[PDB]
Amino acid sequence: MKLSDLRPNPGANKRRKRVGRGPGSGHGKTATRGHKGQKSRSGGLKDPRRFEGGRSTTLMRLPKRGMQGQVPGEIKRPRYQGVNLKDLARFEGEVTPELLVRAGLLKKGYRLKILGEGEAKPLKVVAHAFSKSALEKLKAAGGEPVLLE
Amino acid sequence: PKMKTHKGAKKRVKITASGKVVAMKTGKRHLNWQKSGKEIRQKGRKFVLAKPEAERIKLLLPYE
Amino acid sequence: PRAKTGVVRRRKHKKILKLAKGYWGLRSKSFRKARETLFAAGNYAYAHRKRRKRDFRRLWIVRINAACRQHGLNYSTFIHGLKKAGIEVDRKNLADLAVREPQVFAELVERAKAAQ
Amino acid sequence: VYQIPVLSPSGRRELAADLPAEINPHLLWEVVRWQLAKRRRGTASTKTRGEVAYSGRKIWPQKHTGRARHGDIGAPIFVGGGVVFGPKPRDYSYTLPKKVRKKGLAMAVADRAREGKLLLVEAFAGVNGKTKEFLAWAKEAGLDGSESVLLVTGNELVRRAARNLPWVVTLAPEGLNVYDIVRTERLVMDLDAWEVFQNRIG
RNA sequence: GGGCCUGACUGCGAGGCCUGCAAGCCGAGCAGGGGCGAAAGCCGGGCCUAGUGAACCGGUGGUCCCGUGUGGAAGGGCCAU
RNA sequence: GGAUGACCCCAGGCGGUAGGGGAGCGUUCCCGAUGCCGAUGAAGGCCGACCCGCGAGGGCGGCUGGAGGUAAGGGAAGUGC
RNA sequence: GUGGAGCCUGGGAGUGAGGGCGCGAGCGAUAACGUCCGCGUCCGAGCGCGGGAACAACCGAGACCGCCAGCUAAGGCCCCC
RNA sequence: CUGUUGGGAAGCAGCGCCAGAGAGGGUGAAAGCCCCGUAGGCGAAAGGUGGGGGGAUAGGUGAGGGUACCCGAGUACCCCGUGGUUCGUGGAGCCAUGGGGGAAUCUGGGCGGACCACCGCCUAAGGCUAAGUACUCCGGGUGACCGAUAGCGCACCAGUACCGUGAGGGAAAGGUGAAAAGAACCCCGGGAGGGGAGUGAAAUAGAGCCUGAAACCGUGGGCUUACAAGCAGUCACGGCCCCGAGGGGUUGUGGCGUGCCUAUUGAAGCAUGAGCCGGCGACUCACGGUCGUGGGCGAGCUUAAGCCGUUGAGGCGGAGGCGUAGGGAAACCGAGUCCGAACAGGGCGCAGCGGCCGCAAAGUCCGCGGCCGUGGACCCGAAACCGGGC
RNA sequence: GGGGGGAACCUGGGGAACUGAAACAUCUCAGUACCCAGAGGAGAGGAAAGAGAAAUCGACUCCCUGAGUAGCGGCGAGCGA
Numbered sequence A: 001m002k003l004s005d006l007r008p009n010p011g012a013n014k015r016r017k018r019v020g021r022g023p024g025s026g027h028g029k030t031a032t033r034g035h036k037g038q039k040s041r042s043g044g045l046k047d048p049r050r051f052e053g054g055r056s057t058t059l060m061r062l063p064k065r066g067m068q069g070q071v072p073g074e075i076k077r078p079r080y081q082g083v084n085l086k087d088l089a090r091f092e093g094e095v096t097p098e099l100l101v102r103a104g105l106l107k108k109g110y111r112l113k114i115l116g117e118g119e120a121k122p123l124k125v126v127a128h129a130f131s132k133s134a135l136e137k138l139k140a141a142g143g144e145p146v147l148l149e
Numbered sequence B: 001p002k003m004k005t006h007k008g009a010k011k012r013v014k015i016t017a018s019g020k021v022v023a024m025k026t027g028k029r030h031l032n033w034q035k036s037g038k039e040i041r042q043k044g045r046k047f048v049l050a051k052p053e054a055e056r057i058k059l060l061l062p063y064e
Numbered sequence C: 001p002r003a004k005t006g007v008v009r010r011r012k013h014k015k016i017l018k019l020a021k022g023y024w025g026l027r028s029k030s031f032r033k034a035r036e037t038l039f040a041a042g043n044y045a046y047a048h049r050k051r052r053k054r055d056f057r058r059l060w061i062v063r064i065n066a067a068c069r070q071h072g073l074n075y076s077t078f079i080h081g082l083k084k085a086g087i088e089v090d091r092k093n094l095a096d097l098a099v100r101e102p103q104v105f106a107e108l109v110e111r112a113k114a115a116q
Numbered sequence D: 001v002y003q004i005p006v007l008s009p010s011g012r013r014e015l016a017a018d019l020p021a022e023i024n025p026h027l028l029w030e031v032v033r034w035q036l037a038k039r040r041r042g043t044a045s046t047k048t049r050g051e052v053a054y055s056g057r058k059i060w061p062q063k064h065t066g067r068a069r070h071g072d073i074g075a076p077i078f079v080g081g082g083v084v085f086g087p088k089p090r091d092y093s094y095t096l097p098k099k100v101r102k103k104g105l106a107m108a109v110a111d112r113a114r115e116g117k118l119l120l121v122e123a124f125a126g127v128n129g130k131t132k133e134f135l136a137w138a139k140e141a142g143l144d145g146s147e148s149v150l151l152v153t154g155n156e157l158v159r160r161a162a163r164n165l166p167w168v169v170t171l172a173p174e175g176l177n178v179y180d181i182v183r184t185e186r187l188v189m190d191l192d193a194w195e196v197f198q199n200r201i202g
Numbered sequence E: 001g002g003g004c005c006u007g008a009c010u011g012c013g014a015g016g017c018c019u020g021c022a023a024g025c026c027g028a029g030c031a032g033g034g035g036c037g038a039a040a041g042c043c044g045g046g047c048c049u050a051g052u053g054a055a056c057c058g059g060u061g062g063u064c065c066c067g068u069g070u071g072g073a074a075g076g077g078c079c080a081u
Numbered sequence F: 001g002g003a004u005g006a007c008c009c010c011a012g013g014c015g016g017u018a019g020g021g022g023a024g025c026g027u028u029c030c031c032g033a034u035g036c037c038g039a040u041g042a043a044g045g046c047c048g049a050c051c052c053g054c055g056a057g058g059g060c061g062g063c064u065g066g067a068g069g070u071a072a073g074g075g076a077a078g079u080g081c
Numbered sequence G: 001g002u003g004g005a006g007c008c009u010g011g012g013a014g015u016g017a018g019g020g021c022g023c024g025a026g027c028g029a030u031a032a033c034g035u036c037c038g039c040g041u042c043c044g045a046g047c048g049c050g051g052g053a054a055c056a057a058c059c060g061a062g063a064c065c066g067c068c069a070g071c072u073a074a075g076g077c078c079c080c081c
Numbered sequence H: 001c002u003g004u005u006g007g008g009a010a011g012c013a014g015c016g017c018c019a020g021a022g023a024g025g026g027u028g029a030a031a032g033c034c035c036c037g038u039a040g041g042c043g044a045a046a047g048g049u050g051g052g053g054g055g056a057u058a059g060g061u062g063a064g065g066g067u068a069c070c071c072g073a074g075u076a077c078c079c080c081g082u083g084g085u086u087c088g089u090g091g092a093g094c095c096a097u098g099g100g101g102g103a104a105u106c107u108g109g110g111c112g113g114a115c116c117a118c119c120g121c122c123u124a125a126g127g128c129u130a131a132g133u134a135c136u137c138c139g140g141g142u143g144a145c146c147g148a149u150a151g152c153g154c155a156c157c158a159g160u161a162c163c164g165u166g167a168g169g170g171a172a173a174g175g176u177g178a179a180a181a182g183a184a185c186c187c188c189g190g191g192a193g194g195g196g197a198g199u200g201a202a203a204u205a206g207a208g209c210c211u212g213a214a215a216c217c218g219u220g221g222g223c224u225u226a227c228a229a230g231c232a233g234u235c236a237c238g239g240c241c242c243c244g245a246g247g248g249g250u251u252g253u254g255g256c257g258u259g260c261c262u263a264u265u266g267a268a269g270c271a272u273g274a275g276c277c278g279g280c281g282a283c284u285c286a287c288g289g290u291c292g293u294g295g296g297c298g299a300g301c302u303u304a305a306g307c308c309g310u311u312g313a314g315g316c317g318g319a320g321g322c323g324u325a326g327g328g329a330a331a332c333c334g335a336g337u338c339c340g341a342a343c344a345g346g347g348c349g350c351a352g353c354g355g356c357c358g359c360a361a362a363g364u365c366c367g368c369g370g371c372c373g374u375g376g377a378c379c380c381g382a383a384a385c386c387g388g389g390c
Numbered sequence I: 001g002g003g004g005g006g007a008a009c010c011u012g013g014g015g016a017a018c019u020g021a022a023a024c025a026u027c028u029c030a031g032u033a034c035c036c037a038g039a040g041g042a043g044a045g046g047a048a049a050g051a052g053a054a055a056u057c058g059a060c061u062c063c064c065u066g067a068g069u070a071g072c073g074g075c076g077a078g079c080g081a
Ligand SMILES: NC(=[NH2+])NCCC[C@H](N)C(=O)O
Pocket: D159, D160, D163, D164, D170, D171, D172
């Protein structure tokens, strides 16, 4: 295998579309922009995601809902992330927040709550909270739920 | 530079788990006295935005 | 890297001008007038290839008509007779026979009169 | 998996290592694309109509001169003007996934092993930094120079002796890379180099 | 025309009409507590189609959801208007 | 059919602006290349009724020119008036 | 009814100045190469081909290439033809 | 080193040799070994630097107990007007301060987003302080940077000529040859210029100099043209000329035939644009998004800045990001959740293929491509507006 | 001792407008362009009357990140710790 054999698979590297390069190309002259109007201009239209030709927009006619907050901003409160029993299936012995963090299950800065999906395993699981069903299943499967403060 | 989140949308709308866009029904902010209980009640629910408009609004929320 | 025109445009203009040799004034000397002349030239050639087929059939038919009228019938009668006789020699060869082989053509005429 | 010839004072020994059975050409290509792209200087540059030396003055009135309208002579429509969308200083590097380049490394060595072009050696006899010495050793090792060789060793004296040979590319094992492997017809490695390599792809 | 009344309900809503969107429209049925009727039943205003106005900003009643170290408070949210 | 773009056979489609899609040609530069073509003549220029290609083009030959050019296969753009 | 049919999801558009003709109405004057709708058509994009003297949209007909072969369409067959 | 072809060898041939040096530039062409260099080493009396090493010096240093002396004033602090901050009067704190009022010395005071209490944090109204950061007139190194309309405005005697009262504007213009061997001398000519001679491998390389396109101008030749109606061509045939059952050139006659582009319902159009030729000339890039796609890995995927290495070597780095759960304004609950009295009803949500193996896949990373957002964002063009100057 | 100069860079004192909001005034552009003063090879900042919830951290500067988050906003366009 040498350099002259090194080759991308079909489709991996595709040719660009080049416009305004002649009649034969299919993209000459107007360069696929049609004739005149704002959209054909350099700079083009207002943001198509929002603007609607001057009329009150779809978005702006909908009502606001909920607490939007106010200065000085987000109120610090403990935050929970749920991990399901099924996600605990891979572990042995003792599971803790730091282990679930490391496994890629639990995000940092989040308190750990166990949720009921899947089957419980006889494990000592250490967490900041449990759903009712998670608690039931873990007891029944012979595990030891330890509740933090 | 990175796209900015449109806060007007972020305050009016939510992207559901399957990527639908849900908003509060319009038309009960005021002038309600002569509106039937059926009108008030049904306008108190969320509704799913029609597909073409939802797609536009989702594009305004690149980090949800 | 930069890719200036370099060689490419001169070579394209030369192709066109070579095709335009023989054309009058700027139509063979200027790339622009040569190109315009050629657009029209190509369309004519296409149209006249088609038209050449009609041109020759009309010529044959005229000659055939003259040969027929020497034997007392017109072309349209002669062609009907040939049809009824089942003779399928085409107009190109009928016209040739009419000039190069008058005995054979006269024979064809007889069969055509008889067939009716 | 593979049986790799080893040159020794005791003779042509043999070694076995689990290099990937499957060679993926496309991936190998992607590693070399990345290697060759990130070494780009990206020093191509041009001037825009805003960066060219002329004044911003309107060269003649908008109307009634009988000529085409113009602003300043820096506009790209002018000879000597700015250039439109010319190159600007650019970083062509990108982070190719670690596993891809590690995999690429293993596959590149595997390709040479599958061809019988991978040779390991214990030592380099009498080469103490002189090219003539490496040549003598190379001859005995079966390296007559009819094939290009990527020589991978941590021995500086060996690398110095071979480096000036047209058919030899020299590398310390920390520098083993698939472009240099694929460039060359043969792979020659230290047992020591073979070891840091196996650590790298592990 | 008369009697008794307040369904000119609360919580919802299968299914549709209409329809670019947003709107607009009809709606059986289930629950709560009722009205009339012996009952079957009807009643979620008005024979029907006009009598209207999206957001934003703000008011008032309720709720007691948030409350910037903590308890409150300021101010907001939510329901109604 | 044959098994796979091996080529053959039968059949049907193939006007086209905005526009969508597909497949290619050529230009500058990088790897290939410490190679290879080159004064027994590079690039460029001028001819050609010749060869290949649907075409964009590519060969080849004669003349000019006098020192550079650069393959198969890939990479990147100041890429075709 | 197997069609460059249909339906579903998604990517990319362009278009949002139409125009003639036939038929059906309104406006106009049982005017306009007028104007405004409806059904259809063609031009637009078929200013490619035959006919109509000439002529986008009337009649004939949907041009992949080649032929110094044949049959037809509308229209024609006294000469120009 | 030799031979050989050549004006010339470095080409080709034979036989060698160096290499910690086969980067590169030269030399009459294409040279590792001819030259300049390159690898590897060496070098400063003088001046500059010296953040590294060494040495001085300045400076540096307890414990309880009592005393309540001191601890930055028009200051804090409050109010008024305003600025800064993400904060646009907002519940509006904090930091700064133009005006008014105006303290206290630790049992003093400021802060933790009005305010109050509690609980903490901190020590205002004096000053200094390397390094890590920014820039590039200057020197150097290196380009999938330009190659004389490019690249700086300037490769060249350019911020010049020239324009402008002035501020200010602002060009064009590179190449003989290996070597000047740059053509003695003769000849026509006042000179210019040329013809010989001569140099040169080459002189349409002769200095108005490499190559030497095109428009444009001319000389010579072939065909053709003075009864002819034309978008200039095309199809056919015939004549003549040329190269040798064929082809090339020319065009007499006959047929057919409304330039190109733009803009339009519609243009040959008496609608736009273009004298002709050459060269310059317009859909890009960064970051983010969204689909598609080629791979990697897969309940996981992936690193950023840096750090080490390299000197066209790659690696380390898990901070962080996306994903693995949703529903609710939220408290909160969770395979559910919200509305509700509801165990009602509804909204939004929740569940691979083969014989442990393979395979496929959520997802995610990278490449590529389409399109979107932000920037001048396809290119050229106003009339104007503003600032500082003249 | 000062004065004046220095391509950018830096700090301070002043400080627009086009533009964007598909009009426009708050808002944006932007404390940008520009003027001025000063500094130096840098400049600024710097040793907590800090942060802000961790029973925590420990001067300042700069890069990554946190994060287009928190918030701000004719709650518009946008702005943005
Ligand atoms: N340690 C090494 N051998 N490094 C690679 C070779 C270094 C240098 N580029 C050479 O080829 O001479």
